[PDB]
Design an enzyme around this catalytic site. Structure first.
Site, PDB file in Angstrom:
ATOM      1  N   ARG A 288       6.181  -8.812  24.387  1.00 56.25           N
ATOM      2  CA  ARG A 288       6.319  -9.332  25.749  1.00 56.25           C
ATOM      3  C   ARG A 288       5.024  -9.122  26.534  1.00 56.25           C
ATOM      4  NH1 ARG A 288       9.860  -9.543  30.937  1.00 56.25           N
ATOM      5  NH2 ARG A 288       9.050  -7.877  32.275  1.00 56.25           N
TER       6      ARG A 288
ATOM      7  N   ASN B 108      14.981 -12.801  22.365  1.00 60.56           N
ATOM      8  CA  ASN B 108      15.204 -12.692  20.925  1.00 60.56           C
ATOM      9  C   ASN B 108      16.675 -12.968  20.637  1.00 60.56           C
ATOM     10  OD1 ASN B 108      15.189 -10.068  18.388  1.00 60.56           O
ATOM     11  ND2 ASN B 108      14.600 -12.214  18.164  1.00 60.56           N
TER      12      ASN B 108
END
Length: 121
Positions: A50, A68
């Site tokens: 991220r 995800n």
């Protein structure tokens, strides 16, 4: 004459690469505002950073959302200028440095409302 020789070596002190902080978001109506859904598959080794993902989006001013999936793949949607969306997909082709991407899959899905980039698990 008995004679033996010694051996010795050292090590390498590595570095922890820090993150960054930017952001760019404008709701436009111009024909140029492009949107495509992203879904990448990855090796079962490490999750998607991220850090670099959001840095990328913030730098190139992409909006949308990322997460995800239980499938293993990381999916989401990218929106913004055509070329910046391109920048993001080109980034996606590289993926995260320590995430061996298996296959990238994009989708033609039109403009959506941004929600946030974060590898939710």
């Amino acid at each position: 004459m008995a004679h033996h020789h010694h051996h010795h070596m050292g090590t390498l002190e590595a570095q922890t690469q820090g993150p960054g902080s930017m952001q760019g978001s404008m709701p436009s109506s111009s024909e140029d505002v492009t949107t495509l859904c992203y879904r990448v598959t990855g090796k079962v080794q490490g999750v998607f950073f991220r850090k670099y993902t959001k840095k990328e989006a913030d730098a190139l001013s992409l909006v949308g959302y990322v997460t995800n999936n239980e499938d293993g793949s990381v999916s989401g949607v990218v929106q913004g200028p055509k070329e910046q969306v391109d920048a993001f997909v080109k980034y996606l082709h590289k993926g995260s440095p320590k995430s061996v991407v298996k296959k990238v899959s994009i989708h033609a899905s039109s403009r959506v409302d941004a929600d946030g980039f974060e590898i939710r698990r």
